[PDB]
Amino acid sequence: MTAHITVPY
Amino acid sequence: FVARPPKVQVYSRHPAENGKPNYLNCYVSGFHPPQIEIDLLKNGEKMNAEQSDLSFSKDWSFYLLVHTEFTPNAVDQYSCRVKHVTLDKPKIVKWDRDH
Amino acid sequence: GPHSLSYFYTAVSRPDRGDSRFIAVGYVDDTQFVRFDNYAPNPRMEPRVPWIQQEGQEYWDRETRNVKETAQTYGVGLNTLRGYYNQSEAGSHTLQSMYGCYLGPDGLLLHGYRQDAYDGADYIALNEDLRSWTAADMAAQITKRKWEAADEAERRRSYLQGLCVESLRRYLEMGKDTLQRAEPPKTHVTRHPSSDLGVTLRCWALGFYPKEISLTWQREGQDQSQDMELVETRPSGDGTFQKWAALVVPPGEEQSYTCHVQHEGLQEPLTLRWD
């Protein structure tokens, strides 16, 4: 399962 | 930024024998940026092809596999034609069932 | 040996020529099993092997939406990078990410990884401790300060130790058929009369899984990678892989050369001669 994106660049 | 020309490999899924169905593959690899155009050609004329999903190697360069069902014979000539920002004209690589 | 779950993201800004493109692909070892692409006619998370379809609707719902959120965040990050490097809003740019986890023998994390590249060059990477970051330049250092403040390394570590290896464990049973069996190469040697001062010997390896393989040529015991052509391993199109290694030998000395093949699907190092 893909990872949740938790931060912006 | 970077720009890389594709390495092109033209080959069959299985060893070619005349009269038996098979898959013609053009594998483009080691290129960057991702935009690229690939055509499979029979006797210089374009065919209808599928392609894998865009992925990349450990060095960040992209690779794709275009392929189509085909039945080889002695005289029909096949090739892959590739267009990329690094290519001033589209590059053609001809199929050699021995490579 | 070790099994891996991995995801590869590519985001491509098409500046005032649309919206940002996003494609994600998922692999379990060297077998692709899912894909998403937001330039596709109808973006959805789709199966790419038979086994992964024995999953429920909840899976495709969750995964579709999650990658759809990720795509928007990457459209954001492309313009953020645009600003860091002070680049124009007209030229296209690329943001790549790869992350994943390898399973130990105990069924837990052997090592996890997460790395990004901007325009094909290293940007930022999570170190092997899953606690510190290596930034390639001073823009990646801005990103690193952000991720230090958000304790992002702990989020990635939680994913890599929990959901990644759990997902990999389940996938390794849904696809037991083909994931946990190795396919050895089908090997043969090909001869090409090039001239009367050289013939070409080509050693083939076909239909093998997984991807890693070793192909070398020897003459009477000593290696000849110094004069040997070695194509990059390539997909067969059916989930297996091909490779060959060729060299130029004097006419009549064919038997004097041996091709050596090493692959985890073989019980011992293979040796080959042209017959």
Is residue C100 located within the same domain as residue C111? yes
E strands within chain C?
A: 3-13, 21-28, 31-37, 46-47, 93-103, 109-118, 121-126, 133-135, 186-195, 198-208, 214-219, 222-223, 229-230, 234-235, 241-249, 257-262, 270-272
Q: How far apart are the first and last CA of chain B?
A: 34
The token pair at C216 is 């070398």
* Chain A residues within 8 Å of chain C (Cβ atoms): 1-9
CA C156, C160, C166, C170 torsion: positive or negative?
positive
Q: Are C23 and C48 in contact (CB under 8 A)?
A: no
**CA dist list (Å): C48 to B27, C82, C102:** 19, 34, 21
User: How long a stretch of residues is chain B?
Assistant: 99
Nearest to C262 by CA among C219, C221, C203: C203
* Minimal CA separation from C35 to chain B, in Å: 7
Name, in order, each residue with C-beta under 8 angstroms of A9's C-beta and a sequence gap of 6 or more.
Answer: C76, C77, C80, C81, C95, C143, C146
Is residue C157 located within the same domain as residue C252? no
CA C37, C232, B65, B44 torsion: positive or negative?
positive
Distance CA C187, CA C271 (A): 10
Distance CA B50, CA B32 (A): 21
- Measure CA C269 to chain center: 25
The token pair at C238 is 């059916």
- C94 and chain B: CB distance < 8 Å anywhere? yes
Q: Are C274 and C219 in contact (CB under 8 A)?
A: no
Is residue C211 located within the same domain as residue C239? yes
Distance CA C144, CA C124 (A): 8
**Which of C116, C149, C181 marks a domain boundary?**
C181
Is residue C256 located within the same domain as residue C151? no
Is residue C171 located within the same domain as residue C195? no
Nearest to C13 by CA among C74, C86, C99, C103: C74
From the number of C-beta atoms within 10 Å of its C-beta (0-12, 13-18, 19+), residue C244 rates as: buried
* Minimal CA separation from C91 to chain A, in Å: 19
Indicate the residue type of C50: P
Task: Report, in angstroms and rounded to the nearest whole number, the Rg of chain C calculated over CA atoms.
Answer: 23
Is residue C18 located within the same domain as residue C119? yes
The token pair at B48 is 């209808």
For C234, the domain range is: 182-272
Is residue C135 located within the same domain as residue C202? no
> Residue C82, Cβ neighbours under 10 Å: how many?
17
**CA dist list (Å): C199 to C78, C196, C211, C247:** 52, 8, 29, 8
**CA dist list (Å): B27 to B81, B97, C42, C231, C238:** 11, 15, 26, 12, 13
Question: What is the number of CB-based contacts under 8 A between chain B and chain C?
Answer: 81
Is residue C161 located within the same domain as residue C209? no
**Which of C124, C149, C181 marks a domain boundary?**
C181
CA C33, C36, C37, C43 torsion: positive or negative?
positive
Q: Are B53 and C32 in contact (CB under 8 A)?
A: yes
Residue of A nearest to C150 (CA): A7
* Chain B residues within 8 Å of chain C (Cβ atoms): 1-2, 4, 7, 9, 11, 13-15, 23, 25, 27, 29-30, 32-35, 52-56, 60-62, 65, 67, 98-99
* Minimal CA separation from B17 to chain C, in Å: 15
* Minimal CA separation from A2 to chain C, in Å: 7
CA C201, B65, C97, C5 torsion: positive or negative?
negative
Distance CA C154, CA C235 (A): 36
CB pair distance less than 8 Å for C62 and A4 = no
**CB within 8 Å of chain B, chain C residues 98-117:** 98, 117
Is residue C29 located within the same domain as residue C98? yes
Q: Are B3 and B59 in contact (CB under 8 A)?
A: no
Q: Are C147 and C135 in contact (CB under 8 A)?
A: no
Is residue C148 located within the same domain as residue C46? yes
Resolution of the experimental model, in Å, one decimal: 2.5
Distance CA B68, CA C235 (A): 14
Report DSSP state, residue C209. Answer: B
**Which of C133, C157, C181 marks a domain boundary?**
C181
Task: Report, in angstroms and rounded to the nearest whole number, the Rg of chain B calculated over CA atoms.
Answer: 14
Number of domains observed in the structure of chain C: 2
Q: Supply the angle between the helices C163-174 and C152-161 in degrees, to the nearest 10.
A: 30
Task: Report, in angstroms and rounded to the nearest whole number, the Rg of chain A calculated over CA atoms.
Answer: 7
Residue of C nearest to A5 (CA): C70
Distance CA C196, CA C248 (A): 12
Nearest CB to B33: which of C92, C98, C235?
Answer: C92
Distance CA C7, CA C100 (A): 6
Nearest to C224 by CA among C257, C196, C197: C257
Is residue C38 located within the same domain as residue C60? yes
* Minimal CA separation from C184 to chain A, in Å: 29
From the number of C-beta atoms within 10 Å of its C-beta (0-12, 13-18, 19+), residue C15 rates as: middle
Is residue C134 located within the same domain as residue C210? no
Report DSSP state, residue C156. Answer: H
Nearest CB to C190: which of B33, B62, B98?
Answer: B98
Q: What is the DSSP string of C41-77?
A: SS---EE-SSGGGGS-HHHHHHHHHHHHHHHHHHHHH
Nearest CB to C236: which of B13, B30, B35?
Answer: B13
Nearest CB to C234: which of B4, B23, B27?
Answer: B27
SS (H, E, C) B29-93: EEEECCCCEEEEEECCEECCCEECCCEECCCCCEEEEEEEEECCCCCCCEEEEEECCCCCCCEEE
